[PDB]
Design a protein around this ligand. Structure first.
Ligand SMILES: CCCCCCCCCCCCCCCCCC(=O)OC[C@H](CO[C@@H]1O[C@H](CO[C@H]2O[C@H](CO)[C@H](O)[C@H](O)[C@H]2O)[C@H](O)[C@H](O)[C@H]1O)OC(=O)CCCCCCCCCCCCCCCCC
Ligand SMILES: CCCCCCCCCCCCCCCCCC(=O)OC[C@H](CO[C@@H]1O[C@H](CO[C@H]2O[C@H](CO)[C@H](O)[C@H](O)[C@H]2O)[C@H](O)[C@H](O)[C@H]1O)OC(=O)CCCCCCCCCCCCCCCCC
Ligand code: CLA
Ligand code: CLA
Ligand code: CLA
Ligand code: CLA
Ligand code: CLA
Ligand code: CLA
Ligand SMILES: CC1=C(/C=C/C(C)=C/C=C/C(C)=C/C=C/C=C(C)/C=C/C=C(C)/C=C/C2=C(C)CCCC2(C)C)C(C)(C)CCC1
Ligand SMILES: CC1=C(/C=C/C(C)=C/C=C/C(C)=C/C=C/C=C(C)/C=C/C=C(C)/C=C/C2=C(C)CCCC2(C)C)C(C)(C)CCC1
Ligand SMILES: CCCCCCCCCCCCCCCCCC(=O)O
Ligand code: OEX
Ligand SMILES: [Cl-]
Ligand SMILES: [Cl-]
Ligand SMILES: [Fe+2]
Lengths: 137, 341, 442, 334, 34, 82, 36
């Protein structure tokens, strides 16, 4: 098996437009996910709040839907709680809060797309392991 | 003065590496066991027998490579290259696990070879055959663990796999399934191995710190000559030291050195016996009286009950991936887990 | 009579060549200090906490007030470069004197100069060298005072508003405080000297130590050992080596516990959270999460009957629940605002927890000093992903190992010095074996 | 005739059936205290709340244990690293509930064992021996320090030190594997090589010497009677033994210097056991065994399990089950 | 006058020849990418 | 003392020795190297290549479940990648 | 409990003084060869 374009194809937005990443974008996303996110989100879980994970199906049910590149890029700019009711930039890394989360300072717009793409690809590669936690190690 | 005696003449010539009649068995078999291991750990997968990568070629390191056991579905097949499983195909032989039987069986005849060599050289040089006798413990361990144990089980699949991490998995399997730490035959083995290392260290340290001044150098190694008659350290002073320090000491150099043979050899033999029991699942798993009390009395708790909870965790969390032929599917809700973890 | 593998023992009575070994080796220490700093600098990325980057030297420099501002943010990397370059440059000078005295200089010194030459058995001369070095050491501890009080201050993690560099204007001199630490128990809630938690006490302690070392130094230049000391000790080079190995061992073990428990002179901003800190931060984190969802964390009973979030310590203080009950002696700047007189204050917990505290707890919980030898971060069952081992784990383990071996070296060289001084280090004389002139035990 | 000097003469006398010495003046009372308290507690101590969760564990014989399951149980996690002498308890009842005896025994024992090592130095000096037997003993001594004191200091609680019992020991070593992956740690691997090798070389050396004993006896008597205590002549023939072992392997892999040989015997296990004590001592600060969990993945990114991932499944089952009531939050951080 | 080809010669080369070859195969492996 | 073979320290400080072995040692190293770089090692031993542990939309192990049909089973799995 | 505490302080002090004073009472000289 291999990293075919089919797997690198993920939704761009809620309107079911798609976008096909490069193997390059995906490895860059993975690298950037380990840099800025995995201390909390290793394997697609959330160490500081295990009830919310990065499984596509969970993101799909977030308000603003987050199972797409746009939702996730926006999330990395202006994160909200899962129902969209409050902004959590002050306790969650984001470009909006890069004064207090300095790893976010040097992230470009293209980097955000790669991170979002990584998050959306990985459960296609890993299945239940992505966000499933230690049961699946 | 016929051919047999001439060949004897030649096999027993004094050379850098002695050959002997035993060499005919030993050297082929040792070299093949060892080449099979190096070959398999460098190039051969365990994908079809175990669902595991296991060679340098696949991305493993020295701790995780292994020559892994055949699939459970092979039973105790000898898995000869020309046998009905591989049907002479070398590649499929490798993929079905044929290198495991190859190494195990050539390894066993090499071990015989090696002990015959200790007998052969002992006889030519004119000494008593105790080194050979002692090596019976390594042989007992090897056959009981790599041969007798999987023969009582369902297949070679549950033998140890030849690899560093693979042997670690075998340690943990035996804890979780057999409660082998509770087995008094393992406990006597532990005492013999740890008793051996103690005796090794304490005997070396004693000789080196009761040396006779036999030279003038600060390096005391020069002041020994292998053909001197005289003892090179004081048994009298050594005996006094230990008598005053520990209560009792050795006083007989012969008993001392026999006991150093006796202690680790006996311990290894004892552990071999308990593994023979585990071949049959004849475990020292439980204490009945403890279980009766705990079943009736939920405030009763010992380190013994605490360890079985750990065993039960080991079994359920490792069995699906460690025994893939069984198709265990444990939904999340059935996994034993304490709070939070 | 020594073999090649004991070949430096050939130097015991070659004071010139032995001076060269000591000074060449002094140059390697300084070389490493310099080279390593520049290596860390060339790798340093200021957007990343120091402790996500494998730094052990830059944290020592920043702790001293150089390079950093409020919150431990790095503002200026030039001070680090300077410290590296100067150490690097200085090691060539020690290198130079080292190999000159080891290869070319006079191999013995006592014919060339009665001041620099010494005999190990010369007790007056030995205490004089000891005295000089005691003064040097006292000067050095006063340089730390000078920095704190007259040349910019020190980093103070406890400073209000996230920590900052602070000039120390009232160093503690009260000896009931300073020597009070020496007499605290090393057990939990006490911590002997590892519990020093404020820079006033740190600086004042160094005024005392500097004055004591200078006074001690002058004392040893002017005196020779009293007869009771003359009869207590072995007076030989190897014996003095053995004394100092023991002292290095003691100090290595203390340094181990310092970097593991102390978050004042090893701020968690640079070194990462301590083990107790990280574990306290986990309970804090989930107290916050759960209270935000509506949980009444004070009244929530856990599985055992003890509080799920909050319980009492054995002396009554309100503390975090779960296994971290064991770490309730922990104190840190992010946590102290919640402490009232009876321990954690339930009304501050409900009303006054700040976003920066929530951030800090989350950060410290996810950077606990747990990791594998190949630097996979987190518990031992964690998958690969995070490349992190805490600097505190690195600094604790390394110095435990070194302290252990220096204790072995102490016993090695001490027992040998005793034996060599009595004349039986090379073995038992066959013609005068002491046990053969003793009566049998039974 | 001076009283102090007479007492000094008796303390350090080489005529006492057991050497006392200055190290013995501390070792004798501390070891007697630790022994007397250990025996009493093993037989009769009531259950101890080791993990601080008011879930007491029964360690003693009279409360339903046998020799294998019995233990003096470590002190309560509620105590942590706090000093808990008898006089800090409101009563013996309290002190027993909370695990006080464990502290008394291990502190007294570690002190007495430390002095045991010094006593080994001291008598060597009074007898005019070389001094380094005690250095050999520092290997087992460092190992007991590691599991009774160092590992507790790093994890923050004497409740995670090694129980003083047979099944308690196994509990400690299973939980250590789940929390540190000790088997994948190279210092434990050197310890196994130190202990395996020590047993190997013990047997080797014993068998080579036994093999080359010089006929001094008949077949009706134990050969051990061919050696008389304090005879000057060696009792075996090292050249015949070197000539056998050099041929079993090859010549230059065999010792004919008996001094080098016995030094090798001393140094191999001692050094291996130094390392494994250092392993426990450094896993005390959570620098754990190699982690190759999911280190092999395929061209797509599928995880390709290895024997290390199988180890990890076993480690997980230990992790999730141990101290099953004691964790409220998702990471076992200590 | 020493011989060149001996039983020793064979023991040595019986191990050294495959070792170097195996070291070459294993060094190539460090450059395999997934 | 000796059994009449030429001492090793004489052999490896000798010029003829290194004349032969500066060729034989690198050649062997390069041979083993080519064994892997050509892919031949994979095909000889049957070791999966990184792209052939699974098929694209498969996550089952291709585990041998039969003793006497086992060779046929492996071949079946291998076809399911082609 | 205080009677106990004080008793133990005294016992321990007594033994530690024996130890310190014993090793200060010319211990290098208590060997069988060169006494000084
Ligand atoms: C010390 C000195 C050391 C010197 C040793 C030198 C190396 C020696 C080389 C030894 C080679 C031995 C391998 C023997 C393989 C074996 O046993 O292979 C096993 C087979 C039996 O085969 C197994 O048989 C099982 C039972 O089957 C039976 O039951 C089934 C259940 O219904 C079905 O009906 C089936 O058709 C029927 O055959 C299953 O089928 C297994 O999958 C299948 O492997 O017996 C057979 O080959 C032979 C069995 C009888 C011979 C017993 C020889 C002793 C070897 C065992 C000793 C250990 C004792 C074990 C108990 C502990
Ligand atoms: C000369 C002969 C020597 C004779 C000495 C005999 C008496 C002493 C014997 C040693 C007993 C030591 C027990 C250590 C207990 C422990 O809690 O020790 C750790 C304490 C640190 O204490 C901790 O100190 C902490 C201080 O931090 C506090 O304050 C900090 C300030 O920033 C932070 O704010 C932190 O959050 C806050 O909690 C807390 O008080 C903790 O509760 C408390 O446990 O270390 C300190 O005392 C440092 C002490 C280091 C000694 C320990 C090393 C022992 C090594 C043995 C070597 C064995 C070798 C084998 C040989 C073969
Ligand atoms: C002393 C050396 C020695 C020993 C003891 C063994 C032992 C073994 N080998 Mg190993 N092997 C060796 C050398 C040795 N091998 C060498 C040198 C090589 C390299 C060529 C190999 C390569 C090798 C492979 C590739 C395999 C083995 C296998 C085996 C096993 C099965 C052997 C078998 O069934 O033989 C059957 C044959 C005999 C027992 C010989 C009996 C002959 C008798 C004395 C005479 C009978 C009459 C004769 C046939 C008349 C001729 C008739 C003709 C004119 C028509 C066994 C453990 C197999 C294995 O490990 O399975 C896992 C396997 O696949 N070996
Ligand atoms: C301030 C520290 C110090 C000093 C100055 C000395 C000085 C001395 N020692 Mg002591 N020693 C020390 C600490 C010290 N030691 C410690 C901590 C120990 C315990 C480990 C010892 C144990 C010890 C023993 C056992 C002996 C001495 C001896 C000696 C003398 C000869 C030493 C020699 O030639 O080494 C020469 C150097 C070597 C042989 C090299 C050793 C290499 C080490 C073991 C490995 C280091 C590898 C490193 C960890 C990483 C490598 C990475 C890789 C790329 C290479 C000399 C007076 C001898 C003696 O009694 O003299 C009278 C002797 O027999 N030493
Ligand atoms: C920190 C490490 C250290 C240091 C500083 C020393 C220093 C010394 N050793 Mg020891 N030694 C060491 C490690 C060390 N040793 C170890 C690890 C071993 C075991 C292998 C030994 C074994 C050993 C033996 C066996 C002996 C010594 C001896 C000596 C002394 C004389 C050596 C001599 O004549 O050199 C001669 C060597 C040369 C002329 C070759 C060149 C050496 C130079 C110094 C290299 C430096 C290069 C450097 C890059 C230049 C920078 C210069 C620039 C700053 C201007 C010297 C003081 C000897 C002694 O005690 O004499 C009585 C002696 O016999 N040593
Ligand atoms: C003595 C204290 C000490 C401590 C605590 C550290 C700690 C650290 N170093 Mg530093 N280092 C040291 C001495 C020390 N080093 C020395 C003496 C050198 C000169 C070689 C270096 C050169 C160095 C480099 C070049 C690098 C580090 C790096 C690191 C980090 C990762 C370490 C790692 O993965 O090791 C892996 C573990 C081992 C290699 C195990 C060693 C086991 C030894 C050999 C056995 C002990 C035997 C006895 C002593 C870590 C913060 C890395 C980093 O992240 O830099 C920012 C890095 O790239 N160090
Ligand atoms: C503690 C280390 C040490 C010690 C004890 C000695 C001792 C000695 N050296 Mg050596 N030397 C050393 C280090 C040391 N040196 C270093 C580091 C170098 C290279 C710079 C040299 C280079 C050297 C040479 C080239 C020669 C000596 C010679 C001598 C002898 C006489 C020197 C004299 O007359 O004083 C001279 C006194 C002064 C110049 C007074 C000024 C005070 C100093 C230089 C400034 C203070 C430095 C400060 C305290 C620390 C550094 C600062 C830094 C932390 C930033 C004497 C035995 C001579 C010899 O052996 O000939 C037979 C000789 O020719 N030395
Ligand atoms: C590197 C430091 C150093 C060294 C090696 C020495 C070495 C020496 N000193 Mg000097 N000393 C120093 C620093 C040092 N001194 C300083 C800074 C001062 C000024 C305060 C002095 C003041 C001083 C005086 C006033 C005297 C000495 C004397 C001596 C000699 C006997 C020492 C002795 O037996 O102590 C061993 C210690 C004892 C026998 C009893 C005290 C034991 C301590 C308190 C127990 C604590 C153990 C505990 C576990 C450690 C934890 C900390 C503790 C506070 C709780 C010896 C040559 C004596 C001498 O002959 O001078 C000419 C003497 O009378 N020293
Ligand atoms: C199986 C088989 C066979 C056989 C084969 C062989 C016999 C092989 C061999 C092979 C070989 C024979 C191999 C080898 C290899 C080797 C190697 C691979 C090595 C390596 C090593 C190393 C790596 C080391 C290193 C080191 C270190 C690490 C440290 C210490 C030091 C040193 C340097 C040593 C046959 C044909 C019969 C057929 C069937 C199958
Ligand atoms: C800086 C600082 C500080 C302070 C400190 C100090 C002030 C210290 C001191 C300390 C000291 C003050 C030390 C001590 C020491 C001591 C010791 C360590 C001793 C030892 C002893 C010995 C070793 C002895 C021995 C002997 C005997 C017993 C008998 C006879 C013989 C002899 C002599 C051998 C503080 C914390 C505040 C804070 C931070 C900083
Ligand atoms: C006692 C010594 C026994 C020596 C055993 C060596 C065996 C030599 C290996 C020969 C393997 C050839 C098998 C491949 C061809 C099989 C084809 C078929 O099954 O019809
Ligand atoms: O205590 Mn004994 O054991 Ca070391 O972690 Mn946390 O804590 Mn408890 O759990 Mn896992
Ligand atoms: Cl448990
Ligand atoms: Cl918890
Ligand atoms: Fe011996």
């Amino acid at each position: 098996a291999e990293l075919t374009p089919e797997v690198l194809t993920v939704p761009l937005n809620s309107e079911g437009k798609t976008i096909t990443l490069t193997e390059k974008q995906y490895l860059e996303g993975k690298r950037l996910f380990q840099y800025a996110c995995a201390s909390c989100h290793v394997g697609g879980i959330t160490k500081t709040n295990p009830s919310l994970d990065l499984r596509t199906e969970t993101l799909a049910l977030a308000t603003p839907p987050r199972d797409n590149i746009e939702g996730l890029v926006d999330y990395m700019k202006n994160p909200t709680t899962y129902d969209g009711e409050q902004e959590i930039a002050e306790v969650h890394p984001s470009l909006r809060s890069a004064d207090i989360f300095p790893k976010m300072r040097n992230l470009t717009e293209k980097d955000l797309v790669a991170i979002a793409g990584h998050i959306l690809v990985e459960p296609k590669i890993l299945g239940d392991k992505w966000g499933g936690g230690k049961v699946y190690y | 003065r016929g051919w047999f005696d001439i060949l004897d003449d030649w096999l027993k010539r004094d050379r850098f590496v002695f050959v002997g009649w035993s060499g005919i068995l030993l050297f082929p078999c040792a070299y093949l066991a060892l080449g099979g291991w190096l070959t398999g750990t460098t190039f051969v997968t365990s994908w079809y027998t175990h669902g595991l990568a296991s060679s340098y070629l696949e991305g493993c390191n020295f701790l995780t490579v292994a020559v892994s056991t055949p699939a459970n579905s092979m039973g105790h097949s000898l898995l000869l290259l020309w046998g009905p499983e591989a049907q002479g195909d070398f590649t499929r032989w490798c993929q079905l696990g044929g290198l495991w039987t190859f190494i195990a069986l050539h390894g066993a005849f090499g071990l015989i070879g090696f002990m015959l060599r200790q007998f052969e050289i002992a006889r030519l040089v004119g000494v008593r055959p105790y080194n050979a006798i002692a090596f019976s413990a390594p042989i007992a361990v090897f056959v009981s663990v790599f041969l007798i144990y999987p023969l009582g089980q369902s297949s070679w699949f549950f033998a140890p796999s030849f690899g560093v991490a693979a042997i670690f998995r075998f340690l943990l399997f035996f804890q979780g399934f057999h409660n082998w730490t509770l087995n008094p035959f393992h406990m006597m083995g532990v005492a013999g191995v740890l008793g051996g290392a103690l005796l090794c260290a304490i005997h070396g340290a004693t000789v080196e710190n009761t040396l006779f001044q036999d030279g003038e150098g600060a390096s005391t190694f020069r002041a020994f000559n292998p053909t001197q008659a005289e003892e090179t350290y004081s048994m009298v002073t050594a005996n006094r030291f230990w008598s005053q320090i520990f209560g009792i000491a050795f006083s007989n150099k012969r008993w001392l050195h026999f006991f150093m043979l006796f202690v680790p050899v006996t311990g290894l033999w004892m552990s071999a016996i308990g593994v023979v029991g585990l071949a049959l699942n004849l475990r020292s798993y439980d204490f009945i009286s403890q279980e009766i009390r705990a079943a009736e009395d939920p405030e009763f708790e010992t380190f013994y009950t605490k360890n079985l909870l750990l065993n039960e965790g080991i079994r359920a969390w490792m069995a699906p991936q460690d025994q893939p032929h069984e198709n265990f599917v444990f939904p999340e809700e059935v996994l034993p887990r304490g709070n939070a973890l | 009579g020594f073999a090649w593998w004991a070949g430096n023992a050939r130097l015991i009575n070659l004071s010139g060549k032995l001076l060269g070994a000591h000074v060449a080796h002094a140059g390697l220490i300084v070389f490493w200090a310099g080279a390593m700093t520049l290596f860390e600098l060339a790798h340093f990325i200021p957007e990343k906490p120091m402790y996500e980057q494998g730094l052990i030297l830059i944290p020592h420099i920043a702790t001293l007030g150089w390079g950093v501002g409020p919150g431990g943010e790095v503002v200026d990397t030039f001070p680090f470069f300077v410290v590296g370059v100067v150490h690097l440059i200085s090691s060539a000078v020690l290198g130079f004197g080292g190999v000159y005295h080891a290869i070319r200089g006079p191999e013995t010194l006592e014919e060339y100069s009665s001041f620099f030459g010494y005999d190990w058995k010369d007790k007056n001369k030995m205490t004089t060298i000891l005295g000089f070095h005691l003064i040097v050491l006292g000067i050095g501890a006063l340089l730390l005072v000078a920095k704190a009080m007259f040349f910019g201050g020190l980093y103070d993690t406890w400073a209000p508003g996230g920590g900052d560099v602070r000039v120390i204007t009232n160093p503690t001199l009260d000896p009931r405080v300073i020597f009070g630490y020496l007499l605290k128990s090393p057990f939990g809630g006490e911590g002997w000297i590892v519990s020093v938690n404020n820079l006033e006490d740190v600086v004042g302690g160094h005024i005392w130590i500097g004055l004591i070392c200078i006074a001690g130094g002058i004392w040893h230049i002017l005196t020779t050992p009293f007869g009771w000391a003359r009869r207590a000790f072995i007076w030989s080079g190897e014996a003095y080596l053995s004394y100092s190995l023991g002292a290095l061992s003691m100090m290595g073990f203390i340094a181990t516990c310092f970097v593991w428990f102390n978050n004042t002179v090893y701020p968690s901003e640079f070194y990462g959270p301590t083990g107790p800190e990280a574990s306290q931060a986990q309970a804090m984190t989930f107290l916050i999460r759960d209270q935000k969802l509506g949980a009444n964390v004070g009244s929530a009973q856990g599985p055992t009957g003890l509080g799920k979030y909050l319980m009492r310590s054995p002396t009554g203080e309100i503390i975090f629940g779960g296994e971290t009950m064991r770490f309730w002696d922990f104190r840190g700047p992010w946590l102290e605002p919640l402490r009232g007189p009876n321990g954690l204050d339930l009304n501050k917990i409900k009303n006054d927890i700040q976003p920066w505290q929530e951030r800090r707890a989350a950060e410290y919980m996810t950077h606990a000093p747990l990791g594998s030898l190949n630097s996979v971060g987190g518990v031992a069952t964690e998958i690969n992903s995070v490349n992190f081992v805490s600097p505190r784990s690195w600094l604790a383990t390394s110095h435990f190992v070194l302290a252990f071996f220096f204790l072995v070296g102490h016993l090695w060289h001490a027992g040998r010095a005793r034996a060599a001084a009595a004349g039986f280090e090379k073995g038992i004389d066959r013609e005068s074996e002491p046990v053969l002139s003793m009566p049998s035990l039974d | 005739a001076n009283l102090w000097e007479r007492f000094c003469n008796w303390v350090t006398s080489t005529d006492n059936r057991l050497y006392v010495g200055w190290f013995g003046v501390i070792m004798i009372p501390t070891l007697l205290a630790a022994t007397i308290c250990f025996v009493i507690a093993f037989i009769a101590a009531p259950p101890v709340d080791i993990d601080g969760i008011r879930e007491p564990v029964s360690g003693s014989l009279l409360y339903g244990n046998n020799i294998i399951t019995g233990a003096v149980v470590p002190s309560s996690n509620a105590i942590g690293l706090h000093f808990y002498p008898i006089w800090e308890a409101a009563s013996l009842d309290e002190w027993l509930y909370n695990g006080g005896p464990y502290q008394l025994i291990i502190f007294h024992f570690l002190l007495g064992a430390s002095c045991y090592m010094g006593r080994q130095w001291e008598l060597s000096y009074r007898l005019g021996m070389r001094p380094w037997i005690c250095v050999a003993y520092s290997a087992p001594l460092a190992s007991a320090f590691a599991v009774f004191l160092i590992y507790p200091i790093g994890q923050g609680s004497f409740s995670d030190g090694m129980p003083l019992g047979i099944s308690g020991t196994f509990n400690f070593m299973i939980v250590f594997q789940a929390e540190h992956n000790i088997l994948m740690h190279p210092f434990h691997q050197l310890g196994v090589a130190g202990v395996f090798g020590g047993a190997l070389f013990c047997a080797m050396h014993g068998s080579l010497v036994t093999s080359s004993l010089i006929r001094e006896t008949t077949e009706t008597e134990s050969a051990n009677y061919g050696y008389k205590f304090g005879q000057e002549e060696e009792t075996y023939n090292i050249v015949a033994a070197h000539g056998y072992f050099g041929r079993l392997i090859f010549q230059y892999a065999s010792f004919n210097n008996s001094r080098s040989l016995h030094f090798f015997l001393a140094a191999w296990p001692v050094v291996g056991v130094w390392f494994t004590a250092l392993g426990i001592s450094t896993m005390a600060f959570n620098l754990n065994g190699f982690n190759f969990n999911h280190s092999v993945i395929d061209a797509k990114g599928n995880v390709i399990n290895t024997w290390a991932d199988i180890i990890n499944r076993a480690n997980l089952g230990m992790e999730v089950m141990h101290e099953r009531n004691a964790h409220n939050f998702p990471l076992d951080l200590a | 006058s020493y011989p060149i080809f001996t039983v020793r010669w064979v023991a040595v080369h019986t191990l050294a020849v495959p070792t170097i070859f195996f070291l070459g195969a294993i060094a190539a492996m460090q450059f395999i990418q997934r | 003392g000796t059994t009449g073979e030429r001492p090793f320290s004489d052999i490896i400080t000798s010029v003829r020795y290194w004349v032969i072995h500066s060729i034989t040692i690198p050649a062997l190293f390069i041979a083993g190297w080519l064994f892997v770089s050509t892919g031949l090692a994979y095909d000889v031993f049957g070791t999966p290549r990184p792209d052939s542990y699974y098929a694209q939309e498969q996550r089952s192990i291709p585990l041998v479940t039969d003793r006497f049909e086992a060779k046929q089973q492996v071949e079946t799995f291998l076809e399911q990648l082609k | 409990m205080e009677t106990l505490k004080i008793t133990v302080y005294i016992v321990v002090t007594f033994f530690v003084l024996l130890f310190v004073f014993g090793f200060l009472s010319g211990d290098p000289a208590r060997n069988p060869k060169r006494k000084d």
